[PDB]
Amino acid sequence: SGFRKMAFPSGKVEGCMVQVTCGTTTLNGLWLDDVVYCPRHVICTSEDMFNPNYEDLLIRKSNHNFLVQAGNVQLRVIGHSMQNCVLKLKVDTANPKTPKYKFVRIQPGQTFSVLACYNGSPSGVYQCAMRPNFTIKGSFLNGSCGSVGFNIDYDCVSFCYMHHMVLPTGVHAGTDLEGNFYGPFVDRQTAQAAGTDTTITVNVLAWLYAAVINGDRWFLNRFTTTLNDFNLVAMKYNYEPLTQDHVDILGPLSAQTGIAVLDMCASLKELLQNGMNGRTILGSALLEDEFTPFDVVRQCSGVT
């Protein structure tokens, strides 16, 4: 019973967070095997961030200029490289706590847990979605850079996100663990705009199915709709177009509730055109889009 925005257990990732310090700048790094991953702008000052030539800045650095600290164990650096927007510091000590892990580049609309950190130490954990416009709505302060987002599948930690920048807009931008930014963003303090965000339609439908599973049915209607007629309504409300793949992905939920996807879409149509009329769905007065169909299945079936 009940439905909550739920993060993955963060233990496996806590054992991997280290404090990285080049010069005056200190941010978080991710220590896996004998390599430490961190934002490359750790080698920058606030003055350099206006327009840094990263190659020229890194060439002034040597292994001994990088101070990695895992709690109390000071790691020794024996190699350094720049992969895209991340630094790869080779160290002498392999992390004894290295989990089974993968690096993955998620797609917009997918979710992941963020372990927010400061000075290599964990502060908290929260779930978030990669927005269609490749931003995330997180909670990051100065020095939280290097905090990572991840999913856990049984035994394996799939790292998918590393935090780099807070935009003037207040939204957050970052890279995969290969250092390739999500979205058009760059790691410098220049004027950067995110672009039009849209609502993740497939996730809203998943969350409506979640609401039915938990007893909230007041939005279920007799009407139905066509995938092409719904998308005419969605586009009006800046909802991402619903594809047939999305419909197929909702199949498991449609079967568990005996509600056809297109019947659920018709209910959403009504909600978009007329609103909630003061009611709530799963304790929310807005349509929630940070739950994937898999997030709903996971939480509604007790995946371990």
Place this chain on the structure above:
Amino acid sequence: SGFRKMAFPSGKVEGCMVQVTCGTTTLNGLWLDDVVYCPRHVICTSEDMFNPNYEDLLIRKSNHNFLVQAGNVQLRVIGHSMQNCVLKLKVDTANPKTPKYKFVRIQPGQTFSVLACYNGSPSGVYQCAMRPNFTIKGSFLNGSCGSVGFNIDYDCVSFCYMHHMVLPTGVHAGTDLEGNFYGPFVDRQTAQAAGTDTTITVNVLAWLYAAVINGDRWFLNRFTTTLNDFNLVAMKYNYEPLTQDHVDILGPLSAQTGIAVLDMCASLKELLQNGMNGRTILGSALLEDEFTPFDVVRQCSGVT
């Protein structure tokens, strides 16, 4: 920047979750030092749960009837006792992962993180408040009993909650780690009602201060109010009365924003009487009350 409902890092608690199995029933237990804590109704069948005589049921059990499994390490039971509504199973192996920990009984309105589990394995983590009526709005399935709620202060895990029951109402009830229920609830499948819930007024004000810190100011007004006149409005809207202790607790936030508490209370008065008029505050269309003044300070200052 940004404000999220944030759970504590759950690593320290993951290392403590074990699978407890008496007879057919299996639920989660908490393994600290050489003792395992779990709901006493693990010794019950669904038939016994109607009206169990727990003393008589436990007296039919011996140490060898309790199957504790920590991942793959099967612990040997060498003692068993009933403290209030929890069982204390003495085992031969001390948990090598036992953190510095305390048991605490929280007060209504305080928050804590829940590590939801199934079969002794962690599923996810989420933050929640002890409602004024001593329920919690969580996410629990069959077998999630024994999942625990906790806070972390620097090095110490303060365990404050263990999940026992899902009420017919859909809300969740549980005990402290001494086995004393929060609220009037009992561990049997009888008719139980939670009683009138109210909104945690001090938390809403904290969250309004959070909104100011993050750029949302559209609700700040010129008016002020009296503590006694505000509570006349609060009582009408089933908001808990605001005491002077609450005002003092908000002092740190009032200082960081230059907004007097009673000026913030006047803004809330307006929000309660006129609503949000379609606007949002920190991405929510309802007034949020699961953030304590300390939760806001923690997340707005990057506590590690």
